[PDB]
Amino acid sequence: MTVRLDQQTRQRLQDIVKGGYRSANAAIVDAINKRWEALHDEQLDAAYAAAIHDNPAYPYESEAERSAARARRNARQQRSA
């Protein structure tokens, strides 16, 4: 809650405040939230890589599940045609 900033970091906080944030507080709140969201997307990326390493047909449990899914999709495209 008592935060300490080096010279260029403070100078950057002002740049982002001047860019359209309400105050210093609002900007830091938002920077914390954007960083958290950025790390969340980085972990979602890694989780999909792991699921695919362990199962190359993810999100299908098998290549057979995929085939079925695609044949039913095709059937639906036929019926609208």
């Binding site: 599940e65 085939s67 079925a68 899914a69 044949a71």
Partner: protein, 103 residues
């Protein structure tokens, strides 16, 4: 008839599996098919998956990356309805799977 939250068994061509309806209720009354997500016994740690709780219809997980369209006529045995707490987590998982933006 079918409602968002209900789990039904359905065979898509590889044996009968549990499926959770996620389509909204207006769609489900007027249209011939519904949108559902696979319930499974496999266990994966990814934010698109959600674990069921004790007052949920069954043991296992919901995978929201695996969305499917199922005909009403294809709907088999009614296994129950998920808790609203579990449905909230599923909403999150779905939004994530379909890349809804932050916040």
């Amino acid at each position: 008839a079918p409602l968002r939250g209900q789990v039904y068994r359905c065979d898509l061509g590889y044996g009968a599996k549990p499926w959770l309806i996620v389509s909204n209720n207006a769609r489900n009354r007027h249209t011939a098919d519904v949108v559902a997500v696979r319930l499974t016994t496999t266990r994966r740690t990814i934010p698109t998956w959600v674990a069921m709780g004790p007052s949920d219809p069954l043991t296992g997980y919901v995978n929201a990356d695996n969305i499917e369209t199922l005909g009403k006529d294809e709907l088999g045995d009614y296994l129950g309805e998920v808790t609203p707490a579990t449905m909230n987590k599923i909403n999150t998982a779905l939004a994530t799977a379909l890349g809804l933006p932050w916040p």
